[PDB]
Paper text:
Purified untagged BcsE217−523 crystallized in the presence of c-di-[name], and its structure was determined to 2.2 Å using single-wavelength anomalous dispersion (SAD) phasing on crystals grown from selenomethionine-derivatized protein. The protein packed in the P41212 space group with two BcsE217−523 molecules per asymmetric unit adopting virtually identical conformations with root mean square deviation (RMSD) of 0.835 Å over all atoms. A single c-di-[name] is found splayed in a symmetrical conformation between the two protomers, and nucleotide recognition involves four residues of each subunit, namely, R415 and D418 from the conserved I site-like motif as well as the side chain of H445 and the peptide carbonyl of S432. Unexpectedly, the construct adopts a dual-domain fold with an apparent N-proximal module connecting via an interstitial helix (α6) to a C-terminal domain, in which the last ∼40 residues (C-terminal tail) remain unresolved in the structure. Structural and sequence alignments of BcsEREC* with phosphorylation-competent receiver domains, however, show significant deviation from the amino acid consensus of key functional motifs, indicating that the module is unlikely to function in phosphotransfer-dependent signal transduction.
A third cytosolic protein, [name], has been shown to significantly boost cellulose secretion in vivo and to present a second c-di-[name] binding module in addition to the BcsAPilZ domain. Crystallographic and solution-based data show that [name]’s predicted GIL domain is a degenerate receiver-GGDEF domain tandem (BcsEREC*-GGDEF*), where the divergent diguanylate cyclase module binds both dimeric c-di-[name] and BcsQ through mutually independent interfaces. In addition, we reveal that a third N-terminal domain (BcsENTD) determines the protein’s homooligomerization and targeting of BcsERQ to the membrane as well as previously unreported interactions with transcription antitermination complex components. Together, the data suggest that [name] acts on multiple levels to fine-tune bacterial cellulose secretion, from the early stages of secretion system assembly to the maintenance of a membrane-proximal pool of dimeric c-di-[name] for processive synthase activation.
Numbering used by the authors: 222 to 487
The structure:
Amino acid sequence: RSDEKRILSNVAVLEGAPPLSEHWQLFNNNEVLFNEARTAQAATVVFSLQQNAQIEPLARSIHTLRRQRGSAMKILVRENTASLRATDERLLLACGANMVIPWNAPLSRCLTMIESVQGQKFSRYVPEDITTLLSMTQPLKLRGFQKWDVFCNAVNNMMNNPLLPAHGKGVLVALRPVPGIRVEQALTLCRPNRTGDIMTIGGNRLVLFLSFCRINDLDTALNHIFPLPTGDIFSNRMVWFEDDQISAELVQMRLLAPEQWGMPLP
């Protein structure tokens, strides 16, 4: 029947202690724990975080578990060594973890937090593609059309990522089509070939983000993405190439009603 009371945990979480009840099961590492958690349903899964190199493989495992097992499972990250940055915490929580047990919390407090998550159902939306999430902490790996909010999020995660270079992150360009063309039609002509080049449609504008592109190279970039001259497709264009200008424009973009958000044609 139900595995709601079952606790699957890496050995490191109990800091040397044996299983605390008949419900606890211990695993020598996060790989064997994850493989077991794959067959669980409503169980508590407690991964151990030792070093920063484990963040991405852990993000992938949490993501796989949340998407494939559903909302009943409680997925916890026990930070054993002081390593988790605020950005990587945001990533792990967005991938499907209910809670992170920080390093400075002793074993007794760790045990209190494990009991606190019981009966808690995961109600947050988790994106299907892990690259949508990894774009929070890693350079943009998305390409092509993205829904307005997903586009806004990816560009915003890029401006706020402290590991990225301060300069030349790319160019944000909002293109307005000529009277005879709808944005949905202009979108079918928008075919970027580079990873990091994404676009969206909304409020009668085609909005592109071109990674590592200098402002002087914008026309060159646009000539490669479109098979026809951009002057024949679009009447107007608004460009932002400085971090403050891009961030200021993402604020104005986030004000667009979902009824005004466009989607690609079938």
